[model samples]
Target: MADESSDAAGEPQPAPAPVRRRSSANYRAYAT
Candidate 1:
C-alpha cells in the first residue's frame, strides 16, 4: 500500500532557520 499518512495526516515540515535558529543561537549563548 502507498504511504497515505504523509498526505492525509500532514506531517509537520521542517522549521525555517530564522524561526528556529533563534533558540539555537540562544542555547549557544547561554552555554558559552
Candidate 2:
C-alpha cells in the first residue's frame, strides 16, 4: 500500500504504507 502526505511546507510527499497481516480466518468463511 502507498500513502500520499504533505510536508511542513505543504509539499506533496509519497511514502509506503505500513504492512498488514491478514489472517486466514478472515477469508475462511467466504467459501461457505
Best by lDDT: 1
Clash pairs, model 1 backbone: none
User: Which one wins on TM-score?
Assistant: 1
Query: Residue 28 deviation, candidate 2, in Å?
Result: 0.8
- What is the alpha-carbon lDDT of model 1 when measured against the actual structure? 0.73
Off by over 4 Å in 2: 1-22
For each candidate, the alpha-carbon lDDT, in order, equals 0.73, 0.57
Worst 10 residues of 1 by lDDT: 1-10
lDDT per residue for candidate 2 within 1-32, as digits (tens), equals 23444353476468879754465656766764
Write candidate 1's Cα lDDT for 1-32 as tens digits. Answer: 36867754676677676567678888999998
Provide the clashing-pair count of each candidate structure.
0, 0
**Model 1, residue 5: displacement in angstroms?**
38
Q: Compute the lDDT of residue 10 as modeled in candidate 1.
A: 77
* Error of model 1, residue 14, in angstroms: 14
